[model samples]
Target: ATFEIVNRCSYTVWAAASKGDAALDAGGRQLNSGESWTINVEPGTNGGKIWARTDCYFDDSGSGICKTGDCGGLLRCKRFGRPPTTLAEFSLNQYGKDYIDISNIKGFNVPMNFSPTTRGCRGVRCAADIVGQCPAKLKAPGGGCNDACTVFQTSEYCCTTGKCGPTEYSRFFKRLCPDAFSYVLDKPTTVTCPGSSNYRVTFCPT
Candidate 1:
């Protein structure tokens, strides 16, 4: 069956393979600022679910990764400033860029998937401080170390309080409330990934 993937956003869009093996070669060529592509796939292949490595912006920070090319021209990046504001913007800026060179395989079957977790917006401090969600108190040089947030040393980002790593937060939660809740710290990493802390975590997951 053939499916027409349309770019419905104002900015550019881009797709990539994060998991599975679904062919996206010629059939899934890079689109323009406001373009669409007709993708053909065999029915029942991966349950008709193909994976793609995706991003949405003009520069590497956005949809255009190291392998993907700059689809649109200079004007693409200028629109949103950093990451392309819309999918159209990202697609236009990353079309045709070789994120994957499928030329070697005559007709390879590769799935197109994307990463589940984001860049780094996990820890409380990182989330609050970097995203401008909270106020930063790094004024006393290193004095405001633990005062900022509670960094759990167990894992990289597991707390919702101040700033705690996942592993560390998991340990505490697992100990206090083992039956009620379970945690998954693997989310998209935004511009605000938090750091470690020394504060006593108050909330116990129920």
Candidate 2:
């Protein structure tokens, strides 16, 4: 199976992938607008992430951090990036299927799409004026939006008991991007396809 990550944003995007050293994009990369990168996953790779960071600067030292979706200021991040990132969370060759979702669980920095290129599988999308609609209490510094869980961290927003229901904040996001995961238990977002289905994570998706 492969991941073809594309940058469709007007600005440059620094893309990051995986849970620990999956090494696609050498763990991270600077993708100018319209450029795309690919990663072929070994079977049984299980779950990981493909995401985009914005407003980043990497100089000669390669030590600068990003405004959003950064991982401990490491240029080639081996760790999961900071929140308020747009993401395609995926699981490949798991139980004979490839499960995937687009999410706002960390909040949203850019528009995104997660699609399967084969098997007639369904796709998911997440794009909205999520940044501008952010309530003053949940706003971020870099024109990004914050989720209730990221900002509040309370069990109410971050569900632990299976009974946790959506709040007004999650409703805010869900109403905007019905195809993305707005809360922890919004299982409605996850879609599945046959194993080995090639996929794409398109940033700033149209």
Candidate 3:
């Protein structure tokens, strides 16, 4: 199956992804507004995620900094991107279906949408204006809303133990994107598509 990354935002976005220690099929690239990049993925590819980095400044050797979603300051990510960024996560061909979601459990830097390109699979998205409505305590130093777990580091917010549920802070995110993961216990946010389905990840879909 193929995963297509589309940039619908006004400015440039550095699209990045990883599967295990290896870079994803796209191999990390910059996408200008209205442009799209597609990469083929082998079946049974698991634990892959796509995210956008903003306000990035990279040098000739492909090393520098990003205002948000930097993966160890490397242009090609060898690890997961830092939090306070939106994520389109997937586990392809798992148990006969493709599992996917737009996760804000780690907070959101930009609006995002994830959906199967083929028929019969419903699209899921979190296009809320989170930056403008971020709570004071959860605000990141750079920009965007930091997750409650990252902000408070408490069991109540982080759900570090068993039998944890949503708090008022998590509800705030749920209010914005009801179909997206707002907390660790946000199980209902998961979406499943048939195997061999192609998917699209859009940044700032609005």
Best by lDDT: 3
CA lDDT of every candidate: 0.24, 0.83, 0.86
TM values, all candidates = 0.27, 0.92, 0.95
Q: Residue by residue across 39-91, what tens digits does model 3's lDDT show? A: 77778889888899998988998898888888888887877888887888889
What lDDT does model 3 reach? 0.86
Q: Please give, for residues 1-206, the per-residue lDDT of candidate 2 as tens digits.
A: 77888999999999888665545446788899999988776766666888899889887766788999988776777778888987788877888888888888888888898899887689899878788788788899775998888888798898866678888998888988998888888857788888878988898887
Candidate 2 Cα outliers beyond 4 Å, as residue runs: 20-25
**lDDT, candidate 3, residue 187?**
68
In model 1, the worst 10-residue window by lDDT is 84-93
Q: Evaluate residue 42 in candidate 1 and report its C-alpha lDDT on the 0 to 100 scale.
A: 38
Off by over 4 Å in 1: 17-19, 25-28, 47-206
Off by over 4 Å in 3: none
Clashing pairs in 2: none
